[PDB]
Amino acid sequence: LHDAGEFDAGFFGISPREAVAMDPQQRLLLETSWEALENAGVDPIALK
Amino acid sequence: VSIAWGYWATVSGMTEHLGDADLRRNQRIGMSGLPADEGMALLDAAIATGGTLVAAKFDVAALRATAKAGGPVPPLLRGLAPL
Amino acid sequence: AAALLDLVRRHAAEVLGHSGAESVHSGRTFKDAGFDSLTAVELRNRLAAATGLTLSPAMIFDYPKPPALADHLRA
Amino acid sequence: AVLRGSAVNQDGASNGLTAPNGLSQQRVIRRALAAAGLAPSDVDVVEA
Amino acid sequence: DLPTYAFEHRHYWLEPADPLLGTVVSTPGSDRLTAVAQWSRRAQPWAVDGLVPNAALVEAAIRLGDLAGTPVVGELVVDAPVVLPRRGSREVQLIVGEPGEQRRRPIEVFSREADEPWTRHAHGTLAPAAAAVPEPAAAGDATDVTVAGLRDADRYGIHPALLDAAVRTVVGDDLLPSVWTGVSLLASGATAVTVTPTATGLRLTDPAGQPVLTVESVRGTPFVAEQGTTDALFRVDWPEIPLPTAETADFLPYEATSAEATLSALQAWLADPAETRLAVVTGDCTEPGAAAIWGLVRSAQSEHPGRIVLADLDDPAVLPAVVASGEPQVR
Amino acid sequence: DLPTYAFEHRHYWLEPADPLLGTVVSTPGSDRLTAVAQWSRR
Amino acid sequence: EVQLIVGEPGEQRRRPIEVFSREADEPWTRHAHGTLAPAAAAVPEPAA
């Protein structure tokens, strides 16, 4: 999976310096969880 | 032979009143404790030498590190802590 | 208050590792930018020592917006 | 000894990634007490 | 089925970033070799009570000769055994001179504890590996010696603890081996060796029977040691510094005449709100009253640095320059 | 209640094992100072 | 491998500095050579 180095930091409110520190697995999980939650037709904001 | 003995590791009457702040201040300016047996050896060596000498323990490495870090090195200890 | 805004924005950009002072935007609060305990206390030092004033290490929570903080430094 | 009930939850949205929250602890205590089928006046010592 | 969110992507990654010999330096244009390594308690666990056995130096010289192609130790005279400090580390430098007669490389082992003066611990010559090196004639029954907890035995040809234990049974426990001659290496990494005593040297053979090491002649003498106790004496020397070429300076000159008057001037100056530098001019420091005033002013500047110029002058005209010199104590 | 097993214990542990100036060598007995350094693009 | 050799001080306590260099077993290459002089109390700044 040669696209693992890409991640959105400003979407979740993450500073650039702590983005490199964190494991890419966490970034991939964070993105895919939002993808899955959206795919089910459930509003992520209302889940808080 | 006159020897400027430092703060002896053996507690004496003159050093009855130096508090923890005093020991920390002395160690900050390089003035450390003087061991008893080492004090006797220094007295013998000074009697062999003679003159106005100082027999005290000065931390050379820490003073040099402080000099490199920008700390104020006393003029007399500048020889022991070169810049 | 333009100079204060510029200096605080530049210092925040340096703190957060941002590419430039333009990336940090004056609408989002400090918390949303990614500020926590570690960054805030050292930003306090970096700003106070530069400006020559003293401050409590918790400016972020009292003034969530950079303009409000700059107005506080003005007074 | 006999273990009666237990509960587990998450801190959730707090003042930081590591900061705690009192409400979550209260909720988990109430959940544990409800699961164990006891009352708050029955216990005599808590290991904080 | 609607499409999903469109993200913005940027790249983020974080790429990761012989103890007896240590570092080897070759003199540019010269055949001398300098072996530099750090000696400490955590680096030499087998060195008990700070004392480093001379067999450790022998093994270090053997490794250096292997690097330089001279494993045969023509001579090795131990000036004094190395005693490492409990606290700190000692810098040990091995200077091997350019090869001379019969390609023999002179070798010396200097050591010093940080700022301690350099002291040589071993000296001799190293010869290249001869085509035929006969074993010394046996004089006693061979005895196997094993040392528990040998660390990095494969790193050295013979472990320093193993070599020391081997030489104890020949030279003698009460005698520290001093002079070594004809040390030829035949095997490396041996953990357990059998010592065959000779007239002066010793044979070292593995339990399988293959010869591991030979020493044509080794002798031992009693030893004692000393450390730095006389280095705590300090003398007040007066290195010369050139005065600045400044014709003006801000200062308050005070021609000290007595200790009490100097103290009164000091307290009056302290009470003075004006930020005026004060300079004290006295007689020769060897004088009693001048020395007392000098000590008074020294303590005064200890209390208030940067506001005192203690100048021992025979001509007060250079007083401002001394103030501009930057040194509070100037003679 | 009676005591548990008495294992015999032995120790096992695996030990984890100035760019321009580098290392300065002060010649013993000589004022000469020889600095050695490793200079590379990285 | 780059080495800086400073010999025993000579005239005016000037220390002779030489910058030799070599790669693996290549011949030593003296790059920059000169003398280092002790600092004076007042260094005259050149005219602008």
Q: Which helix (H) or strand (E) segment is E103 a member of?
A: none
d(CA C73, CA C55): 10
Amino acid identity, position E219: R
In contact, E236 and E298? CB cutoff 8 Å: no
Cα–Cα–Cα angle for E247, E248, E251, nearest 5°? 135
d(CA E287, CA E300): 20
Parallel, antiparallel or unpaired: strands B2-3 and B52-55: parallel
The residue ranges of DSSP E strands in chain B, in sequence order, are 2-3, 52-55
Q: Which helix (H) or strand (E) segment is E288 a member of?
A: helix E288-303
Helices E160-171 and E54-68 meet at what angle, rounded to 10?
120
Distance from CA of C18 to the nearest CA of D (A): 21
- Tokens coding E223: 């030893």
Interface probe, candidates E18, E23, E42, chain F, greatest F C-beta count within 10 A? E23
Q: Which helix (H) or strand (E) segment is E111 a member of?
A: strand E105-112
Amino acid identity, position G15: R
| Dihedral sign (CA E273, E277, E283, E289) | positive
Beta bridge pairs of residue E309: E279
d(CA E215, CA A34): 76
Q: Cβ of E244 and G3 within 8 Å? A: no
Is C56 exposed, middle or buried (CB count within 10 Å of its CB: 0-12, 13-18, 19+)? exposed
Q: Say which of F23, F29, F36 has its CB closest to residue E118.
A: F29
d(CA D47, CA B29): 50
d(CA B47, CA F23): 41
Cα–Cα–Cα angle for C45, C50, C56, nearest 5°? 35
Q: Cβ of E230 and B72 within 8 Å? A: no
Q: Which chain G residue lies closest to E29 (C-alpha atoms)? A: G28
Q: What single DSSP character describes residue E117?
A: P
Q: In Å, what is the CA distance from D13 to each residue of A35, C60, D19, D22, E182?
A: 21, 18, 10, 12, 78
**E118 interfaces chain F, CB cutoff of 8 Å:** yes
- Which residues numbered 19-58 in C keep a CB inside 8 Å of some CB on A? 19, 31-35, 39
Q: Cβ of A19 and E12 within 8 Å? A: yes
Phi, psi of E219 (to 5 degrees): -125, 155
Parallel, antiparallel or unpaired: strands E90-96 and E211-221: unpaired
d(CA C15, CA C11): 6
By C-alpha distance, which of B75, B9, B15 is closest to E232?
A: B9
Amino acid identity, position G20: F
Q: Resolution of this entry in Å?
A: 3.2
Helical residues (DSSP H) of E93-176, grouped into ranges: 160-171
- Tokens coding D5: 């009930």
By C-alpha distance, which of E137, E145, E143, E134 is closest to E198?
A: E137
d(CA G33, CA G4): 9
**C13 interfaces chain A, CB cutoff of 8 Å:** no
By C-alpha distance, which of E168, E204, E64, E171 is closest to E122?
A: E64
Parallel, antiparallel or unpaired: strands E278-282 and E308-312: parallel
Distance from CA of A20 to the nearest CA of C (A): 11
Phi, psi of B39 (to 5 degrees): -65, -45
Is F6 exposed, middle or buried (CB count within 10 Å of its CB: 0-12, 13-18, 19+)? exposed
Is D33 exposed, middle or buried (CB count within 10 Å of its CB: 0-12, 13-18, 19+)? middle
Q: What method did the depositors use to determine the structure?
A: cryo-EM
Q: Which chain G residue lies closest to F33 (C-alpha atoms)? A: G6
Distance from CA of B42 to the nearest CA of E (A): 7
Q: Give the largest Cα separation in chain A, rounded.
A: 34
Q: Distance from CA of residue E92 to its chain's centroid?
A: 6
In contact, E245 and E164? CB cutoff 8 Å: no
Distance from CA of E4 to the nearest CA of A (A): 7
User: Which chains are adjacent to chain E, needing at least 3 Cβ pairs under 8 Å?
Assistant: A, B, F, G
Helices and strands (H and E) in chain G: how many = 0, 3
Tokens 């004088």 found at: E287
d(CA C41, CA C46): 9
Q: Which helix (H) or strand (E) segment is E322 a member of?
A: helix E319-325
Q: Cβ of C37 and D17 within 8 Å? A: no
Q: Which chain C residue lies closest to D16 (C-alpha atoms)? A: C36
Q: Which chain E residue lies closest to F36 (C-alpha atoms)? A: E25
- Tokens coding F39: 């200079």
**B55 interfaces chain E, CB cutoff of 8 Å:** yes
Q: Which helix (H) or strand (E) segment is D27 a member of?
A: helix D22-36
Helical residues (DSSP H) of E248-305, grouped into ranges: 259-271, 288-303
In contact, E48 and E66? CB cutoff 8 Å: no
Q: What is the dihedral of CA E244, E245, E250, E251, to 10 degrees?
A: 60
Contacts with E13 (C-beta within 8 Å, 6 or more apart), sequence order = A5, A20
User: Which chains are adjacent to chain G, needing at least 3 Cβ pairs under 8 Å?
Assistant: E, F
Cα–Cα–Cα angle for A6, A11, A13, nearest 5°? 110
d(CA E173, CA D28): 72
- Which residues numbered 175-234 in E keep a CB inside 8 Å of some CB on B? 229-230, 232-234
List CB contacts (< 8 A) between A13 and chain C.
31-34
List CB contacts (< 8 A) between A17 and chain C.
16-17
List CB contacts (< 8 A) between C37 and chain D.
16
Interface probe, candidates C31, C35, C37, C62, chain D, greatest D C-beta count within 10 A? C37
Q: What single DSSP character describes residue E138?
A: B
d(CA D36, CA D4): 5
- Tokens coding B64: 């040099």
- Tokens coding F21: 């100036």
